Structure formats: structure tokens, C-alpha cells
Amino acid sequence: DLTLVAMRTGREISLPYPVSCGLTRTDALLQGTEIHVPVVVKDIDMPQYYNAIDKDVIEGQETVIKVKQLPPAMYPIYTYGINTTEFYSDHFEDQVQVEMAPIDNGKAVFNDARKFSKFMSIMRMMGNDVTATDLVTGRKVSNWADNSSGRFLYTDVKYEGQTAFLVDMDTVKARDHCWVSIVDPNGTMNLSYKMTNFR
Amino acid sequence: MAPIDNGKAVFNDARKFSKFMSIMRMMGNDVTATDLVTGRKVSNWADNSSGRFLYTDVKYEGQTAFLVDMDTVKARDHCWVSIVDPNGTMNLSYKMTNFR
Amino acid sequence: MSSLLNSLLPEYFKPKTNLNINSSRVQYGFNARIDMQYEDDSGTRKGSRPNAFMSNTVAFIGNYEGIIVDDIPILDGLRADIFDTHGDLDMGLVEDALSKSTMIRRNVPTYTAYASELLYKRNLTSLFYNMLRLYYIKKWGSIKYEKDAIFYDNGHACLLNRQLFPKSRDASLESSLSLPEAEIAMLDPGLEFPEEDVPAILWHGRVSSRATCILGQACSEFAPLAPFSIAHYSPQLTRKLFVNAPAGIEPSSGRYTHEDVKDAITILVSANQAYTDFEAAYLMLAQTLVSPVPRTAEASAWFINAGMVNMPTLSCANGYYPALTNVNPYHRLDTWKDTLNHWVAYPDMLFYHSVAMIESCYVELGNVARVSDSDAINKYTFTELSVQGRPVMNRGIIVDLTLVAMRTGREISLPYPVSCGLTRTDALLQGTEIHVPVVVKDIDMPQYYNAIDKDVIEGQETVIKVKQLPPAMYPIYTYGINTTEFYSDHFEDQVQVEMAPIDNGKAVFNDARKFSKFMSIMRMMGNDVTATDLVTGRKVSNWADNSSGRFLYTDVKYEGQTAFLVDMDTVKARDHCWVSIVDPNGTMNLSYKMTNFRAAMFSRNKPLYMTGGSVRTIATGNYRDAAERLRAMDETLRLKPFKITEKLDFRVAAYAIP
Amino acid sequence: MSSLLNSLLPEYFKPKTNLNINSSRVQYGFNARIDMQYEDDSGTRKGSRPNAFMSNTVAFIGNYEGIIVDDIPILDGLRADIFDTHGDLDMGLVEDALSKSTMIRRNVPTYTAYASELLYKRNLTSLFYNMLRLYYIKKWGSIKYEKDAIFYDNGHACLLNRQLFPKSRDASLESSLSLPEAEIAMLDPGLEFPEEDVPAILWHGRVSSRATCILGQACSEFAPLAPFSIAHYSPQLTRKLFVNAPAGIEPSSGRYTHEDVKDAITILVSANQAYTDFEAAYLMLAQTLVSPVPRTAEASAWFINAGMVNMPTLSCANGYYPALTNVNPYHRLDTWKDTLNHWVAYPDMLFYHSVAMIESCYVELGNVARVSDSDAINKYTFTELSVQGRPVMNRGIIVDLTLVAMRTGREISLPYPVSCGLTRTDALLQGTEIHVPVVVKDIDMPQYYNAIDKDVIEGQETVIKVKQLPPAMYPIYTYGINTTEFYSDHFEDQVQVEMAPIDNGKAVFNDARKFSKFMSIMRMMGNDVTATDLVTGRKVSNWADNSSGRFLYTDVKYEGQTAFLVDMDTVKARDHCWVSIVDPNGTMNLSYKMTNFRAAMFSRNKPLYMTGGSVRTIATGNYRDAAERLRAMDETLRLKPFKITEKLDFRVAAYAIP
């Protein structure tokens, strides 16, 4: 636990005695096997999003989700922009440039995985419900997959494969309050934000 | 060359897809790919008269990703250069002489 | 040792990750372009072979037997403090190391006494060997062995799988073995006296239901039905195996996927710090995995008698004393985790490393067999002069790695002098003619082969005599890295020979070297010439091997001195380029160039294509944060190469120190 | 002393830790390449044996009998304060030391009075000796002894195990002894007056359940059934043994392994500070671990009567005076812990140290038996002039160490002049005829051997009269380090036999020296020569051994005038790899050359290989440099970080060191 803190802050932690007592967290990681978490369903269109065991499930049924790679359990908040990585993208200033031509009728394909993550994340700050669909596999991902942080990490796809995300920009829905509207875009889009003060 | 997973190679970029099918045509390999957005089959052997591949043979303005069928690569016209299984970075250098 | 066997592959070839093997036979070669130029007294002629396929054939069939022997301990993974200023294990410091890392100090005198006896016999190489074999049985578990199939087939003679492998039946690879399960018990912490002749191993967290079944079957006896390379007979490793797991082990499931065996190996190595033990097992499997299909019928003499695989005894004392294994392990080389990191990333790459190793051994044994038994370096005393360490016995891997050094001409070095694996030089080290059993296909068989019965009928089972062992394989991957006169595997070469006077329709070739050069030219032009050996009275043919398009002098099948009567009237035209002429006149000059190499693999008379992505390099430098190279070149194994010095005889080979 | 016995081993010999002995007979030796030559007026005939095996057979049987004798006290261990300037117990500082301690005040005056007698009872050599024998009995317990087995056989004469060892039943070494346990009582600290004639020892913490069983059996009578060397007859050391352990003595377990005996020794030496006592016990066992199988039939005279082992009486008064032993002991030599530290690390090395000592002794007693009594340094007075100390009696280890000093040609130094162990020079000093029994095979025996009967039918039990004792072992480990002309153990040697054509093969050797070299070199060449003495009329054969393959002059079995007729048309070729003497004419010149040496061991007519780690030369400095180091790295858990680095893919993470 102390060696993980040393990696986060980026400093040298020193104790007087090399004592080895307390909780061990790295248990499910080192096993390197599939884990079967139980879930009770609410809607009927669940198993498209989550990697479920059943393909058709009536509401109020107890199902199982197959988790292979462990997603992050917490988002950095106290350690925000002290040792920044491009995965979490916990910057004060950030921008993304999605390049579209008028010949394309709103439909954009993200060949790159990095800028797809930043587009889907900044659109959620702006209070827009985007629903992308993978062209190779045929699954779907939604940027609204959290009600705490309000960011989109790439591990919300729940699948490691080839990157071909079709996003249709005439099915974008305004969900939250205090939001900027994308009524009908034409040409190159440039999104950007700035965090100024903290309380 | 894109990684061949089962018997299919995903070409996400547009420029790389144009260069790939342009090489395989000069070697003389009738390759058939599936456009993932539309769901229609493209073929590099569209025009027989002029022995070249233009990107307009896809017949879809806009952005897409192609799933190339690497198992069903037919051998129409074979010179000694002609290979079926590409591996890594493909280099083709040709010279045209003796016009009449 | 990944970096060693990876170097053997040719510079042009870089193989992809996956390879879907779906048969018990794989051809491997290259498609080269030959530009021949002919000149004689009549005039000049220029041609060009546009596509020429030179290939060997390798199979998954080889009769092997396991023996449990006592070998050296691998002292890698133990904490660095117990070792003194030199590279030696001091029992004075083991007492201190165990004392400081406990509150209960009553048990220190007892713990030290048992530890001193067990540390000098620690070896997990035999356990990883069986775990690796279980991985490949599950992965390639759809390969069929038919009993009434062909082994070698030329046209005159034939060998079936009934012969060479009696006591065999028709079975798939998954159907070959029905392994039992050894008792995987839990070591409760509190037991004071380690039970003797039972090893104890560490584990990360809870032992999975699937991990139990793998460890149970890995320790059990292997009893095959069909002869397979990766299912050979092995004795029982242990009866019990303790596992010091804080969380209790689960009962055995019964079934497991090939993916589950990877998870079992990755945990077992990481916990025990047994990285060098894995490197030994990796090299040990590279020898066994594949076996050569013989070039000619005489080259079946190698694979009659069952070669012995020396499996080290399974012992480990990490479970009892987990204080000795800590966060600061002792290692001799800084590149000591490369072999595992290579396998876990690219499992199917072992096939290419195995083909590269067995080729290098069986090519160089072609030369060692021809060495006269009245020189400094001969078949008996070639290993002993080469090695510069202190192993238990010059057996197993030491013999194989000595032949790789002689091939490549570079100094090979391992951290520990391990003597574990297959010994090939058994048929070689005996002054006796070997009786290869064969089947007669054509009535004129006794004229070609040295048969017992001089009159035969199509269908009869006879026996042929082999005195000197011919080469089993031709150089393909190791083509032109160092060229001997025997093989003549040049890129560019100018062959010059003087044609003998054609009296009636026959040309007498009294000299041995001139005869070899003549038939070598006529083969490259593509003329099937047949000559009569005057001493024996048997017919030789340059078209002996179709796969590799070259002529070796061992195709005559007569050690000693002779004169050949070549039939110049009956020169058939099998393959004709524009260079190809039938009537040579005076001094024959042939100058050829080989360009445009490209690797190709065939399986079941169709092209076998490589799948997956491109292999990115994984490799660690000589230093991580180490200041001074403390040489420590006393215990490390070193193998010195020998260079072949050609002499006038041509039939005899001779080695010298470079 | 591990140091002096280590130097006796050859330079080419590189020993390993473990040696898996599974029999009661070992043929230790070396493989050498002999280049023999026979020059003559007609021409030269060259030979070459690439692997020539020169061996000395060593067994685990030998009749010995222990007797309890009075020996000097060993004062190493006691605190350095009580000693004066000269180095003897200054009584007055003892009374001062006891007064300023944690002793009961009413016991001080009565205990101080006894000190004058009890403090000079310090000799634990007998206890350590018995505890070392228990270690090797349980380790090599599976070795067998058959009653009707062949002790010696040379074709003509045979000597069975029934002949030398009557009252002998066939049994395994483990099943030989049935040791009864002596009482191990706890010393009451509040005892009125110390009980002399009852030894009291110290212990660290609690006496374990197994330590009671080991100490109980160590201080008991050895009454064996089979005549084994490490299970010979010993009297009862003591009836009762006190142990000053505040933590109570647990009752006897009954069973124990060989590892538990090492635990018992290491606690006993550390508590009592008795390292010099252990060094004496190590050298004692080195003599009487293995006995040599006789080279010739008439060399069995050494092992007819049982040689007495001198075990010093068990006497220790540390239990009564705990204050006088502390962490600052008095020692003469600085390297006083080296012998124990060597044994704890490498227990099985004692086998090599044992054969080195007996081979050194029995070689020198060979060429000591061939000196006339009328001389300065002779049979009786070779020990007195060599010894420059003050031992009680010239017996035990003093006689064996002085013979080693003569062999190697160096000065052997011990800290205390202790006189305990086996005495070998018994049959020599008697100077009388010895009557060895023999069972005959052929009917023409009594011409060769000096037998009691002149006509004896096959299968009869006869007697041979041995007057002068022949050498029991040939020098092998000490080959060409201190060469004498008797053994003729040179690397290069030649002999010139001068004959004229007028003589029809018959040569008479007037000289005795060159007759020995001719007969010896002819046996290397594999030729069976049979000479006949002209004066007496007896016969000698060069083939009188199947181990070394040399001819010593003591094989004549008679001292007289030298006139040996050898007929050189009755020479028969016996062995393989031999040069032929078909028909010689003129002067003969024989010669050989030994070039290289490789250590080899045989057991049950199979190769015995050394396994385990590489044995080093342990020095006092190699451990105490790690004490100087102390691991001075302040024991503070400093965790260093890793900065994550992003690259093209971004899906997978990569950590850097800085």
C-alpha cells in the first residue's frame, strides 16, 4: 500500500522498521482469471451494454456479468493534477479537434482511441448524452456510465479489440442543466474547458 | 499490413486501404472487402480496361472502416512477384518503360 | 534461452505471433532465384531458374523415454544477504537471516540444520517441463497418428509407422494420455519438522479449482499409446506436493483449458522466483518438441533406438522457510527474466526456435560422423575439449549446445552448468552396422540399396545395412552463415571440373572430388545422370532427394575408395532451363548467383499461412543500475567453437582450434 | 583439522557436496592416457590406451575395539580472566570470579574447594565421536553385509568374510546396532556438594524431545552384529549425564532423523565452547570410517587381529560452574572454529578426507616395513624423532599424522598434543609370522604362495605364512608428488633389457631394480609374463592384481639372491588395447608417458557421479568480513517510485525507473 502511494505522489516513503502487517488489496489482480459478479436487472435492453451471461433477460431477474480486466474503482480527486497521466486526463486545461466535412451527414468514425475518450468526456461536462456503436464487434457504449465524477474512462467500453467507433451527431440528447447545445454542426469541431478555483 | 485476427484484417484508415488494394492489383490478386457502415462488398477488380484502383470504386462518400477477406484472395493474373500472404511493412517499387 | 535460439533464424525472416498447426508434418524452406552461367570448349550458354523451392520436412513423431537423475542446484531467487562477498552460499549467514525474521527463536537451531541439507538440492525444471507439455497437448490436441501411414517414400523403398514404432495404435493427441492426479495437500504453518522426499512451493492468494488439477497431473506418470514428441514416457516426479497458501486450496475440478495452464505457470514462477529454472525447461523442450523426417532411407538409423531424456529430481524448500525468499533476490545475469517474458507474450514462437535447434544439431553431426577416430577432436572427445565449466556429466543439453557453437561459430554461455534433456549421440557412439527395416515397392530395389536378400518381390519386408550415418537434414535456416566444401551451400560459387574421355558411351571418374563436382553441376542444370560403382556393383543417382535440390557424396552409400563408370548415353532431361546442355566438352565452368529469398511453409500439401500481428522485440540490457561487472566467470558454462579445416581426401573431415 | 586433510587431495580433483553411497565397496581412482612404445633393432611398435583406470578398492568393514584411557585436559573454552600470563588456571582469580556471579552464597566456599580437581576435567572428544557415528549410521543406513561374500579373490587364492570375521550374522547397517538409552537427569542448581565421576554439560534454552534420545544413545555401549567400521565395539562412556538447563528436559521421543543429530551437535559445541574437542573427534573418525581392501592375497596380515581404538574418558564440569564460560573465551590458535564450520556446510566431504588419510598411512607403512632394525630411523623409533611436543603416549593420531608428514613432506601442527584414535602399527612392531587363512581355487597354488601344504585339492581351507608385510594400497591421490623408486610412480619411465641373438629369447636379470620395471611396463602393454627364480626354484607372475595394474618387488614373497630367468617365447596377450612382442632380437627399449588426469569413482560395477553445489576453501576471513559488513544498510523501508510513461497505443501502461 505504501509503494503504491510512492508511485502516485512521486516521493520517497521511509519507515523506521520494515513491518509487514495490515490489509492486502492486490488479490483479485494477481489471480488473473474471470470474476463472476451478481446483478439484478432493471431494463430489458441490458446485455448489449454489459458483457452479460444471458442475451435476453426479463426485468427483476438475477444475472451474472463476466469481468476480465479490472476497471478503476475510484477517480483521482485529492490527487487531481499533481502527477497527471493521459489515461485519467485530470488536466486543468484540455482540448479535442474532431475533423468532419459537410459531405458527411453528421456521422464521424474515430480511428484513434485517445481522442475518442476526450470527446466523449468533454461532451458529458456540456450535459450531452452521446451513444457510440463499435463497427467491428457491434456493441454500444454510453458516456453517461457514472453519477459521481462525470468523466468517461476508456475501460467503460468493457472490451479490448480494434478501434472503429461510429458516433451519429443527430441523436445527441440534452440531459443535465447548465449545458451548451449542439443543434446542427458543420465542418471541424473544437471543444475546450478551464477549471479556475477549488473549494 | 493490419493484424489478421481470424481470416479478416480491419483497415480503419482511408489512405492505407487505398495503397493496400493498389499493390494487390499490380501483383494481380482479386481481393474483396466488406464496408462495415453500409454493409456492401467492394472489389479492386471493378474496371478491366484500365488496370488501376481508384477510391471512388467503394461507392460511399463519407467515413467508414473496411473488413478485408484475406482467406478468399483469388489468383486471376500471376507474375513471379505475385504473393498471397503479406507480412509486416509492404514495399512495392515498379518502373514503366517501352510505351507504344 | 530466447535471445540465443532467436539469433539462429535468418536475418530476412521475422515470423508473426500465432501459427495454427493442424497436422503431424510441416515442410519449411525458401523460394530463391538462381542465375546460372555455363562455359566449356564448345561455347557459352546463359539461363535463369525463376522459382526454386529448397525445404526440409519435420514431424511430431519421436520415441523418447524419461529417467529421474540428480543434477546441480540452481541458486537463483534466494535473498542476496545469505551469499558472502564471493558467489558462495555460507551457512553462517543463513542462521543470521532466519534469526532476524522471527519472534519465536527456539526453532532457529532446528531450522538451520534442515535448511543446510535441502538448499544444495533445489530444482523446479522437471515440474515446468511437464506443465509446458500439458499446455501444447491441449492447444494442438487434434493431430491424428495413423499406424498404416508412410514415414519415408522415395519410389524404390518405403518405411511404414508399423515399423520403427511397434506397440502403437491409432489415436489423437488428446486421446493418447489419461493422466492420474497426485495429492496436492495444504501446509499448515506450525509444523516444525519438514517431511522428507516431499517438496513445498509458495503461491499467490487462493489456489484456484483449475490450478489444483494442473499441478496434480504435472507430477503424475505419463503413459502414452501413440508415439508423440510432447507425450513421451516420463516417471512419477513425486507422490505428494505441499502448497504454503495462506487461503486454503479448493478440490480438483477435473477439466481445464490451455489458457488456464498459462495462469498456473505465471503465478508459480513469480511466487517462487524460479525464472532460471524455467529457462532450463524451455531449452529442454526445444530439443524434444519436433523430430526430423529423414532426407534418405539410410538416415532412419538415427531414430531406431529410443533416446533417453534426463529429467532432474523434483526438490524445493520455499514452502517450509519463506524467509529465505524475499524482495532482493540473487541473480548472476541481469537478463534473467527474458525467457519467461518472451514465452508468456508469444507462446507459438517455440515451434520456430525448436526447428532452428534440431536443424543445427543434425547438420553438424553429418560432419562429426565422417571424422576419422585417430585425431585430437573425434566423436568420443569433442564435447570434453569444448566445455569450460564443471557439470555432473557431459550429457543432455551440453552435447546439443556444443553442436550449435560448432555450426554458428560463436561462444555460447549459460549461467549454470545444467545437464538435463535429450542425448542424440547414441546411434553414433557404437562400432556396429544398424539394421533399418524397409518395404520393397519396385523389383529392382537390391541394385540401389545395400539389401540382405539380393532377389525380392513387390510387397516383401526386407532389411538394409547402414555402416556410416548420412546427414538427416540439409542447411535451410543456417544457409551460408559458414560454408563447408561437403554441403557447398554458397550464395555465389564458380565450380570448375575437367570432363573424362567418353570411350564408348561411358566416362570413368577415378578421383572422388571431381566426381562430386561433376554430378553437382549436372543437377543444377537438371540432368538425371546414373553411374555404376565398380567395386560394389551398385547404381548411384544424383536425384536421391527431391525436397533439397543438391547432391551430397554420402548418396553413393559406400565408405572407402572406389571408381565410378558414368552412363553418358542415358542422361534423362527432368527439368530444363536454357542453360541446360546434355553433351559436356573439355573443362566445365558453372557460375551461379542466389538472390530474392522468401520463407514459405507447407502442411498437408497446401500452403500454411502465419496469422496474428508482428512480433515486437522484448530484451533487457547488460546493466539495470549495476556499477561494476563482477565477472564471476568460475561457475558459468562456456562452449568454444571448432572450425572445419578442409584437406585433400574430401571423404574425411577434420576439426581445428580457431 | 579440515585444513591439513584438504591439502592431501589432488589439484585436478574438484569435489562437490553430495555423494550418494548405496554399497559397502567404492573403487576411487583416475583415468589417464598412456602412450606406450617398444623399440628394437627390427623396428618400433607404438600403442595408446586413451582411458586407463588405476583404482584402489575401499570398503566400509573392519574389526575395531574401543578402550577407555586417561588423556590430557583441553583448556580452550574457559574465560580468559581466570588464566595467568603463562597459560594455566591461577586459582585465586577463580574464587574471585565465583564470588562476583549469580551463585548461591552458601555454596561458594564448598564449590571453590572442589575447583582444584573438577576444573581440570575437560575432554568431550568421546561424546562428539559417538554422536558423529550416529549421524552416518542413519544417513548411509541401507548398505548391506552378506556373510558368505568375497573379501578378496585373485584367481589362485580366495578369502571369504566368514574367515576373517567369525561370530558375524548378515544384516543391514541400520539393523546392526540396538542401542539402549542412558539416563539424562536435570541438574538441581541448589545441590550441596558437586558429584564427581558424573559429567554435567551446558545447553541453550530447552532440551528438545529428540536431543534426549540422541544424548541417551551416544553415552551407551555399542554391541554390533555385523563387523561395520562406523558401528565398532565401544564401552559405556557413562551411566548418568546431568544437563544444566533451567527449561526442563522433555522425555525421550524414541525416533530421530540424521538432520536432528546435526542440531544436537551445533547446540552442544556453542554452549560448552568446545571447538578443539570437536577437531580431535573429526580426525579420530577420519582414520576409522573406511578400511582398505588388500591389494594382494598376502596383504591381509594387517587386518587379522583387531586394532585398539583409544577413546578418552568422558569428563566435563561446566554444569557446576556456569559463570566460568562466557562470550570471551581463551584460545591458542585464531582459526579454532574452522573444523566445525567445514563439517556443518559439507558433511559428506569426510569420505574424501578419510580415504586421503588411510592411503597416505598404508603407502608409508609399505616402505617403512622394508628397513633393517640396525639403523637410526627404523620400525620402532620413527615416531620419537619426528614428534617435537609432550604427548602422554605415542599412540592414536600422533602415529598417523607423523606418517602423513613423511608422505607429503610438510610440517603438521596441532594446538594440543592429544593422543586418541586408532593405532595401525600393531602387526609391524610384533615382528613375527602371521597365519592368514585361504580357500584354494586351482590345484597349482603352493608354487606361487608360501603355503603350509605342497599338494592341496580345490575347495580346501589352507594357511599362507606372511613374514614381511607387503603394501596394502598403491599411491593414487599422492601420485608423483613425493616419488620413490620402490613404487616407481613417475609420469615418464624407461627400461633397457640387453639380449644377443645367440640367446634364444632367454634373459637372466642379475639386477633386481630393472626386473621390477620390466615386469610392470609389460603389464601396461597387456602381456602375461611368468619368471622363474634359478636359486630357489619358485615362480612369480606380473598379473598379481586387478586394481592398480603395476608390479611391486614384494610380489616375489621371498628375500634371497636375484637370478630371474624369463623365457620370451611364452609371453601371452591377455588384455585389450595392447602392443604385441611377436619375436624380439637384440636390445629391447620399453617406455610410457602419462599426459592428463580425470577423477573417476566406481560402485556396484557402475559409475558413481558427484552431485550438488561446488565445494569452496572456507577461510576464517570469509564469514567475519560479513560481520565487518554487519549488513550496515540501516533497516529502514525506503520505497522508491515509478513514473508512468505514455506511448502510441495508450490502452496498455508502461512504467520507467526514474
Author numbering:
A (entry chain A): 400 to 598
B (entry chain R): 499 to 598
C (entry chain B), D (entry chain A): 1 to 658
Original paper wording:
L-BC virus persists in the budding yeast Saccharomyces cerevisiae, whereas other viruses from the family Totiviridae infect a diverse group of organisms including protists, fungi, arthropods, and vertebrates.
Furthermore, we identified an open particle of L-BC that lacks one decamer of capsid proteins. Three-dimensional reconstruction of the open particles, with imposed fivefold symmetry, produced a 10 Å resolution capsid structure with one missing decamer of capsid proteins. The opening in the particle has a diameter of 16 nm. Overall, the structure of the open particle corresponds to that of virions and empty capsids; however, fifteen capsid proteins, two B and one A subunit from each of the five decamers that border the opening, have smeared densities indicating their high mobility. The three subunits are located further away from the particle center, and the B subunits are also shifted away from the hole. The icosahedral asymmetric unit forming the border of the opening contains fewer resolved residues than those from the remainder of the capsid. The domain swaps of βU strands between A subunits related by a fivefold axis and the existence of open particles indicate that capsids of L-BC virus are assembled from decamers. Furthermore, the open particles may be assembly intermediates that are prepared for the incorporation of the virus (+) strand RNA.
